Amino acid sequence: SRMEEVD
Amino acid sequence: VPEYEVKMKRFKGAAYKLRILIENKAPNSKPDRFSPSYNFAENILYINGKLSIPLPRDIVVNAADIKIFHIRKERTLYIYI
Amino acid sequence: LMSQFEKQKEQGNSLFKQGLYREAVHCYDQLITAQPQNPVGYSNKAMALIKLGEYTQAIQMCQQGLRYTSTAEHVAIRSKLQYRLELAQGAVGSVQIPVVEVDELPEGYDRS
Numbered sequence: 001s002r003m004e005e006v007d
Numbered sequence: 008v009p010e011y012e013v014k015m016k017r018f019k020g021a022a023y024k025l026r027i028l029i030e031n032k033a034p035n036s037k038p039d040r041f042s043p044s045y046n047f048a049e050n051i052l053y054i055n056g057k058l059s060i061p062l063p064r065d066i067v068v069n070a071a072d073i074k075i076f077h078i079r080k081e082r083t084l085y086i087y088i
Numbered sequence: 089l090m091s092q093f094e095k096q097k098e099q100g101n102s103l104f105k106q107g108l109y110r111e112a113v114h115c116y117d118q119l120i121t122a123q124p125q126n127p128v129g130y131s132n133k134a135m136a137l138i139k140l141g142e143y144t145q146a147i148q149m150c151q152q153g154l155r156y157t158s159t160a161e162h163v164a165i166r167s168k169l170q171y172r173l174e175l176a177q178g179a180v181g182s183v184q185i186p187v188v189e190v191d192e193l194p195e196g197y198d199r200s
Contacts, residue, residue: 003171006101006112007196018198025199046182066189071151075187076197085193 008032011058021088024066029084030052039082045070049057054084062088093122104136112136127153127165134172136175144183148174 011034016026026046031039044053053059062068066088074087090098100115113136117125119129130153137146150173157166 017168047177
C-alpha cells in the first residue's frame with residue numbers, strides 16, 4: 001500500500 | 008484560408024532545446040484562431056484544426072515549460088520547448 | 089507534538105481516507121501556502137484531485153511538485169508524483185497549452 005496512499 | 012509555414016531550430020546549452028516558428032503567409036487573410044493542445048502519448052503539439060507539430064523524440068517535454076508567444080502583426084507563433 | 093503544518097497535513101489525510109476529497113484539498117492548499125517548496129502538499133493535493141476527477145488540475149499540481157524533487161533526498165516522493173502525473177495525463181490524453189499574445193518576445197528568447 002504505497003502509490004495510492006497520501007503522505 | 009490561412010497558409011501556414013513551419014520552421015524548426017534546435018538549441019544547445021539553453022533553457023529550451025527547440026524553437027518552432029509558425030507563420031501565416033496568406034495575404035487576404037482572416038485573424039488567426041489558436042487553441043493549442045499537447046498530447047502526451049503521441050508527443051504531438053496540435054495548433055489548430057489544420058496544423059500539428061510532432062515533437063522530436065530526443066527531447067524531454069514538460070507541458071508546463073512549453074512557451075507559446077503570438078505576435079499578431081507578424082501573424083507569427085513562436086514556440087519554445 | 090505535531091507541528092501546525094503536520095497537524096494540517098494529518099487532518100487533510102484523515103479527510104482523504106474518509107473520502108472527503110474537496111475538504112482534503114482545502115487542507116493541502118494550506119500546506120502549499122505555508123511551504124511552497126514542500127512536495128508533499130502537491131502530491132497529496134494531486135491524489136485528492138484525482139479522486140475528484142480533476143485530472144487537468146492534478147497534472148498541474150504534479151508539474152509544480154516535481155520542480156522540488158530533483159535531488160536524491162526526494163526520490164520516494166518523486167516516484168509518488170510521477171505516478172499521479174502519469175495517471176492524470178493518461179486520463180486526459182492531452183492538455184491545452186496557453187498562447188501568450190505579445191507585442192514582442194520577452195528577453196532571453198532567441199529571434200535569430
